[PDB]
From Swiss-Prot, chains A, B:
Molecular function GO terms recorded: isomerase activity
Protein name: (4E)-oxalomesaconate Delta-isomerase
Keywords on record: Aromatic hydrocarbons catabolism, Isomerase, Plasmid
Isomerase listed as a keyword: yes
Biological or metabolic pathway of the protein: Secondary metabolite metabolism; lignin degradation
Gene assigned in the entry: ligU
Catalytic reactions on record: (1E)-4-oxobut-1-ene-1,2,4-tricarboxylate = (3Z)-2-oxo-4-carboxy-3-hexenedioate
Role according to the record: Contributes to the degradation of lignin at the level of the protocatechuate 4,5-cleavage pathway. Catalyzes the isomerization of the double bond between C4 and C5 in (4E)-oxalomesaconate (OMA) to (3Z)-2-keto-4-carboxy-3-hexenedioate (KCH), where the double bond has migrated between C3 and C4 via a 1,3-allylic isomerization.
Endpoints of the signal sequence: none
Enzyme Commission no: 5.3.3.-
Organism: Novosphingobium sp. (strain KA1)
One record GO biological process: lignin catabolic process
Length: 351, 351
């Protein structure tokens, strides 16, 4: 009651606590109080709980067996604020998602089935579907292997992840304005939602090249003020209402690729620069690369073929996105690599 | 083998992983590799393990039943470096120590004995003894209660802690120079070890008042260069050898008390300012307050009586130290309040 079984995992480049739904209070307010206490929030240092004093390590997954047709488990993502008594069920960023498949198997929501085991995951926050393929050699999840992702030392078991029903996850449409491009504060942008609502505009159009490192971007007050005025201006158009204290849309500043990739991106999510790029924001940006004349179309190098592999270059490397594009040109699925690791398993306590 | 039972606790204003000795490899090199992997080191973000990406949350306690006369458990403290593949068994700072008593009781090294339970702890790093009194109402440790310590939100069960055999823990003598005061780079200082080797000098003597906040102190390059030249100059005198890449001695800049206390301290440990003060450094400073004409004697207000309560004021509050002083004037024991909390219990995993 003042404890719950819990597995602490790294999912992608994030970390947090993974629960079975039936182990947390049914009452939302009771649930949030418990998770705040588990993390040690509110406290800039989160010294009296399991948060790592950074929003990326103050995250929670709630997983349960699904009754939806074709779905194996339902997954609710929760952000536990570091220094506010606030838990939000914001848009999925796609990193904590990576631990969901392995966690479900370990907890018996899904039994191991051969040496690899498919987990079909409904993302309750947005209504999207992720199919994760996880290594279960011998009938037990493994986290060891040869996969790498930027921002994570060494190598782990690959978890290839295929996203469906991304389109208009949050905005109700791929293009909530109905336009490929909209002029906003005199600038051409794309308002797009293929898994994450994004505003996609050229880095050069807001006075940077798009190749600056994260620290310089975080210190560029005039850049931040400029794109933030754009974000606040488009919230209604994107069916997002007043975005002032919202986490969306992500601001995606695109420049031509430099390392032979598809596109270069600097992401503000919305107010600080992402060290890499969010998974679902990569899908939105890779999709915008395909819409003609659009800011991202103008900078991107897009390969021919129905199965398009788009290497999205970011501050510290690149994240590769495989778009499967039907003969009508819409994106039918996006596949991206994740990794995760079980770090501690047992019981968490609150006062 | 690639896991161990482990309890994650907050101890004082630090956090880390608590093990039974018999659950870790006997081989030191094997042990260090395992603990590095457990924390997610080396990695500035410690994203692939249980470290909180700060040295204060990248700490380990190793506890076992003691055979020493009068000792209940042996405790070895280990610092797991955040971004280096290095584990050190440095001097005890006294915060992780606070979880040792409760952990021993929970693991059955010591059985609960009534509603409060004494744990006599040998600190293997330095040879000191700490007696911790822990609440065991009903025969089970509790972490709830009305105690507070600066740097930890809310309140917890008190763990009153009494230190003995502090004198010359590391230096072999209370005063390794044999002098109450030594002139170093033209400045009077006290080289003292009553639980933590410290250099004690007046804040004013190095060009600050001693009331500056931590951020200003951390940014004072000329202050840091000045006291660091002092530290490097005294390492041999204190029987510490070449202190260049050492963590000791702590630099303690004392000023007259301002909130009715005994003394005001700003601590460099050795290169960044402490947010409060270390427990054992408080004992060393409180002891130096009693040695006549000495820098700390000149600034301190010392109360009459054989049981002296010295409120050591620090950046974010004060830490109170009860010295029990025998008729010969030496310190016979120092008592200080700690708190701890069990945060997660179960098993930790490495690849
Ligand atoms: Cl459940
Ligand atoms: Cl936060
Ligand atoms: Cl997610
Ligand atoms: Cl043991
Ligand atoms: Cl470190
Ligand atoms: Cl300690």
């Amino acid at each position: 009651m003042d404890s719950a079984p819990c597995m602490w995992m790294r999912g992608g480049t994030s970390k947090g606590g993974y629960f079975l739904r039936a182990d947390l209070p049914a009452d939302t307010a009771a649930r949030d109080a418990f998770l705040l206490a588990v993390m040690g929030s509110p406290d800039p240092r989160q010294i009296d709980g399991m948060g790592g004093a950074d929003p990326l390590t103050s995250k929670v997954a709630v997983v349960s067996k699904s009754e939806r047709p074709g779905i194996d488990v339902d997954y609710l993502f929760l952000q536990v604020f570091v220094d506010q008594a606030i838990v939000t069920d914001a848009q999925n960023s796609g990193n904590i998602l990576a631990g969901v498949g392995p966690f479900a198997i370990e907890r018996g929501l899904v039994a191991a089935s051969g040496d690899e085991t498919r987990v079909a995951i409904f993302m309750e926050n947005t209504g999207q579907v992720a199919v994760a393929t996880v290594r279960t050699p011998g009938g037990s999840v493994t986290y060891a292997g040869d996969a790498a992702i930027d921002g994570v030392p060494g190598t782990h078991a690959p978890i290839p992840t295929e996203f469906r029903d991304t389109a208009g996850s949050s905005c109700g449409a791929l293009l909530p304005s109905g336009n490929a491009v909209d002029v906003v504060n005199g600038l051409p942008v794309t308002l797009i939602d293929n898994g994450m609502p994004c505003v996609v505009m050229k880095a050069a159009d807001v006075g940077i090249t798009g190749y600056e490192d994260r620290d310089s971007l975080d210190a560029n007050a005039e850049l931040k003020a400029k794109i933030e005025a754009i974000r606040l201006a488009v919230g209604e158009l994107m069916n997002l209402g007043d975005v002032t204290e919202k986490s969306v849309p992500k601001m995606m500043l695109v420049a031509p690729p430099r390392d032979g990739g598809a596109v270069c991106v600097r992401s503000f999510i919305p107010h600080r620069a992402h060290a890499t790029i969010g998974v679902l924001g990569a899908v939105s940006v890779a999709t915008a690369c395909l819409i003609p004349g659009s800011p991202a179309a103008e900078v991107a190098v897009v390969p021919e073929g129905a199965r398009k592999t788009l290497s999205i270059e970011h501050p510290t490397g690149e994240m590769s996105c495989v778009l499967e594009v039907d003969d009508a040109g819409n994106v039918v699925s996006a596949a991206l690599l994740r990794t995760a690791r079980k770090l501690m398993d047992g019981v968490v306590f609150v006062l």
